[PDB]
Design a protein around this ligand. Sequence first.
Ligand SMILES: N#Cc1c(NCCN2CCCCC2)sc(-c2ccnc(Nc3cccc(O)c3)n2)c1-c1cccc(Cl)c1
Length: 344
Amino acid sequence: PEMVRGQVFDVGPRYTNLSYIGEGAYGMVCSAYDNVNKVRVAIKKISPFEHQTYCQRTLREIKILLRFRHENIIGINDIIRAPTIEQMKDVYIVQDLMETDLYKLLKTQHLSNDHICYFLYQILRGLKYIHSANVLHRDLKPSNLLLNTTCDLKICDFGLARVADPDHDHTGFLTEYVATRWYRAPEIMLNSKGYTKSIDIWSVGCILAEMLSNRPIFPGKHYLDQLNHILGILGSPSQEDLNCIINLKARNYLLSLPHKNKVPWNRLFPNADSKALDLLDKMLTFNPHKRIEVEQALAHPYLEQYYDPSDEPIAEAPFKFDDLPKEKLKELIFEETARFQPGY
Ligand SMILES: N#Cc1c(NCCN2CCCCC2)sc(-c2ccnc(Nc3cccc(O)c3)n2)c1-c1cccc(Cl)c1
């Protein structure tokens, strides 16, 4: 086997010419040449068997990726792992190599309104399919949006994804959260576990604001600072939106803050299309129940040039609602990846 840093990357002889790309929420990503299909691919190494939580996430990610089939969601080409459970310590997931991501593009490239409109359409088209499968991505951000040389957009890393569970979304004030800080909806910091579809819509809204200016709209430096950045632009929540927050600690925190008025979108983004700002406003709504849904967002006049509900497919087999030990999860990961084995 070949080494990349100080770690084994056992994908050869089919996959050679390894180069380090980076990391997902977990796992090490490399580019490689597929000697069989004569194309360069991306490969993610996952070593989750020593921990239950890692095993659960690895199992969900693989189950989700294998079940999903959509143009705006990157699929799995192959899975490399040992032929036996005893010999299996690592899992390698193979996907088509995408040229870049929206994070890298936004660092140095100004987006035309046409590119913003097209990227947003593709994000929401992929998201419609994800949400139709009763799945939440939960870590949408520019680095999880891959692009090729013709601007085809594909959503990646379902490492923090979960089956939607709105009945168990309520939690206490200041509950620790796993997903990337800057794209976290205000309710995460107040009373939400991020188990509802509205959590992904907030993240897409943050991505849209970022595509308009090439800078994250809410760059919180720590947990509560993230909420301060959000209220600094949306302004103080209304009495109606506060009445929706039953948790006393979360409500009293918001009531203790000095009153802030709404910063108009047309002042933050003076060169933006007015329809894009109307959609931005509806995605970046404080109250998650009033926040626009993915199908409504696709039907928004800003996306009129692309909107075609018959060419925005939904999932054929949605997921249903776990606490199994890591040894039983290793067996399920082994079973889930069995179809990619040489004998199969
Ligand atoms: N998780 C994850 C991934 C990514 N997360 C983002 C990593 N990124 C690295 C650069 C700095 C910001 C964070 S990317 C990824 C993947 C899949 C297909 N093509 C590419 N291409 C790509 C992405 C980034 C840079 C680059 O040179 C190429 N990546 C994957 C991936 C690769 C193989 C299998 C699976 Cl299940 C996922």
